[PDB]
């Protein structure tokens, strides 16, 4: 037997092993996040015990056949993947100590909950009590209290994990030859050897601070156009030149500030393209909103989902007996089993993130047929993207006149097309500089950039810098408010998020020139066009056997993010707010804060 | 959530 031969008899072995296993420790994270009870987490405990090992042994088998010996580029790659030692090199015990800080770190923000100053018998959490505070509140005090007693009985808690945390996650990168942890993430986006598609990791940090440039200006008009709607909605608390405080914008970070819409709606008048009231008013349910999904995704050519999709989904919050999850996810675990599990609402938020989850399953579903390591998205941001697009064309006013939630007597002019521009900037352009701004903090404390004693120094006056967003309330270095976010205390890479919004653009662009859309690309719906739901599968199918770049490549022409598509999208918004800031000042002060 | 990587295999719920 040859070397590849070899190869071929062990990759065959190691894929059929992997799908059993792997639907397994699926089932049993499934019935966790499902059903949260002590026995479940036992097992998922136990599972994900089983899964690590399992992978550890067959990288160690997978080393012997060498990769110069392989011909073969489908068993090539899947040796690649194999071959990475990722967390192993650290020690047995080493290894524990930070599995158990993650784990504490997990524990600590969900069950993490503040008490009101008096009558502190009665407690909230932040998944509702809090968010809906920081969703809903117009009582800047209240917003206040929110932001500071989470950050502070929380965070402070997360302080010294995250502390140990840095360590060891550097510590096991560069026992991979990586810089550090940051490096170690940037990975993801890494090609070598494919003949000038190649990417390097140093290459991601020059091309989102590139792209960020561009975006800058569009962000500054709409920051300071939200400035000023904002000082009409919390009079005396905000300075025209200032930047905007932390608790006042719409969610428990400003990670999106899609709550401001109604405050920030230019042309109140036009009829509401928030379509949560005529959801309502209709009667809509979660099974209405996934089956309206499911027909988007049928109108362009693509399956529409298996019965064991609505059999074995949850698509409601089961009650207040079994706590559950209630993070949005598309669940693939193989042999054919494909799920969702949303505690899904009666709003156009969650209409559109159905249509966002049910565009994972139909990417999952499209690669369904690759080996085991390469059915996964091209890169971290490829799957985000995927979705993002169908929510793009699910928001569009032409889309929610077409299945009733605008009147069938409705009419777009100029002003509803600002009223949906802005509201898709709230969400898309306002989340860029967040997304980039706290990625960045991670990514120089990882390197080293930043001291300890400078941690919540540095944090915040990147946020003054580059969000624009100031803190209400001092804090010292016994917070750690990053970590006040789940992404950041479960271990998230977060730079997907910034790539995904410039990939979506892209695709939308090409599918639109496939639907041979004819006007502005913010009007353009690809439902009913089975031409853009092709080239959409053409790269869906193609699962990760080839290069994020060339993928890119294969639908929008282009081997690298572009930031043009973006603004192109939001051009005439672009406009009307430079307009409508030629009074107001544009930019703003590091120095003001709400304190001093 | 598990995970089909071996970089990656399990991320926390
Ligand atoms: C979720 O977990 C609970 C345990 O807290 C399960 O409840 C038990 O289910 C068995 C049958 O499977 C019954 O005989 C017990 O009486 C139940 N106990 C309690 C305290 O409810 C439940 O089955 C799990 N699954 C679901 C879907 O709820
Ligand atoms: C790499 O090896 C795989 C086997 O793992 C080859 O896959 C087979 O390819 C032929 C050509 O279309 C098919 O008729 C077989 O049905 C495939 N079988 C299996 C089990 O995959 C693949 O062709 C090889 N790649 C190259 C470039 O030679
Ligand atoms: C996709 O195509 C279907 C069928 O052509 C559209 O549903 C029709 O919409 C027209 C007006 O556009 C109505 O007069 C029909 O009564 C609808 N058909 C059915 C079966 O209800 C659907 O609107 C199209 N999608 C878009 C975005 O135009
Ligand atoms: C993994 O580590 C082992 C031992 O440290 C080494 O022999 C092997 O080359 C490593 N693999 C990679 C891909 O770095
Ligand atoms: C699923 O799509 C098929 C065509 O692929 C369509 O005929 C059918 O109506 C859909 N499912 C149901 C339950 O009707
Ligand atoms: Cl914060
Ligand atoms: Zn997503």
Redesign the pocket.
């Known amino acids: 037997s040859t070397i590849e031969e070899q190869a ?1 008899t062990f ?2 072995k190691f894929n059929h092993e992997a799908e059993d296993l792997f639907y397994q420790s699926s089932l049993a994270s499934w019935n966790y996040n499902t059903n949260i009870t002590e026995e479940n987490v036992q097992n998922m405990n136990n599972a994900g015990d089983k899964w690590s090992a399992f992978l550890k042994e067959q990288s160690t088998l997978a080393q012997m056949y060498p990769l110069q010996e392989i ?5 090539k790659l899947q040796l690649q993947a194999l071959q990475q030692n990722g967390s192993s090199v650290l020690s047995e015990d080493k290894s524990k100590r930070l599995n158990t800080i993650l784990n504490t770190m997990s524990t600590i923000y969900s069950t993490g909950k503040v008490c009101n100053p008096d009558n502190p018998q009665e407690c909230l959490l932040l998944e509702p009590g809090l968010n809906e505070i920081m969703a809903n509140s117009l009582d800047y005090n209240e917003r206040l209290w929110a932001w500071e007693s989470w950050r502070s009985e929380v965070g402070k808690q997360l302080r010294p994990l995250y502390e140990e945390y840095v360590v060891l996650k550097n510590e096991m990168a560069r026992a991979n030859h990586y810089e550090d942890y940051g490096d170690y993430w940037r990975g993801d986006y890494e090609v070598n050897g494919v003949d000038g598609y190649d990417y390097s990791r140093g290459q991601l940090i020059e091309d989102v601070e590139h792209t960020f440039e561009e975006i800058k200006p569009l962000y500054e008009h709409l920051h300071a156009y939200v400035r000023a709607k904002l000082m009409n909605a919390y009079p005396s608390y905000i300075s025209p030149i200032g930047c905007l405080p932390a608790h006042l914008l719409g969610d428990m970070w400003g990670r999106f500030w899609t709550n401001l819409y109604s405050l920030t709606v230019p042309f109140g008048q036009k009829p509401n393209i928030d379509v949560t009231d005529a959801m309502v008013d209709q009667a809509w349910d979660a099974q209405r909103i996934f089956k309206e999904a499911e027909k988007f995704f049928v109108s362009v050519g693509l399956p529409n989902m298996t019965q064991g999709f609505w059999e074995n989904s949850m698509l409601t919050d089961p009650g207040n007996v079994q706590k559950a999850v209630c993070h949005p996810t598309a669940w693939d675990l193989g042999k054919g089993d494909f799920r969702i599990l949303m505690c899904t609402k009666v709003t156009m938020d969650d209409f559109l993130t159905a249509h966002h989850e049910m565009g994972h399953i139909q990417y999952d579903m499209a690669y369904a047929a690759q ?1 085991f390591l390469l059915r996964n998205g091209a890169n971290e941001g490829f799957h985000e993207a995927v979705g993002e697009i169908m929510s793009l064309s699910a928001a569009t006013p032409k889309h929610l006149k077409s299945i009733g939630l605008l009147s069938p007597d409705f009419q777009e002019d100029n002003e509803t097309e600002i009223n949906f521009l802005l509201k898709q900037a709230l969400t898309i352009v306002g989340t860029l500089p967040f997304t980039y701004m706290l990625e960045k903090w991670r990514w120089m404390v990882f390197k080293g950039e930043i001291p300890k004693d400078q941690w919540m120094k540095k944090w915040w006056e990147m946020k003054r810098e580059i969000v624009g967003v100031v803190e209400p309330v001092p804090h010292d270095e016994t917070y750690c408010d990053p970590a006040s976010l789940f992404h950041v205390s479960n271990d998230y890479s977060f730079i997907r998020y910034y790539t995904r919004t410039l990939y979506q653009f892209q695709f939308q662009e090409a599918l639109c020139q496939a639907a041979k859309h004819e006007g502005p690309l913010h009007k353009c719906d690809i439902s009913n066009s089975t031409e853009a739901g092709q080239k959409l599968f053409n790269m869906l199918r193609l699962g990760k056997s080839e290069p994020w770049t060339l993928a890119l490549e294969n639908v929008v022409g282009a081997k690298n993010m572009n930031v043009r598509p973006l603004l192109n999208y939001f051009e005439p918004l672009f406009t009307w707010l430079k307009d409508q800031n030629k009074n107001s000042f544009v930019g703003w002060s590091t120095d003001w804060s709400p304190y001093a | 959530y598990f995970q089909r990587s071996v970089r990656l295999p399990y991320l926390r719920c």
């Open positions: 071929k990759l065959d011909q073969n580029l489908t068993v080996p």
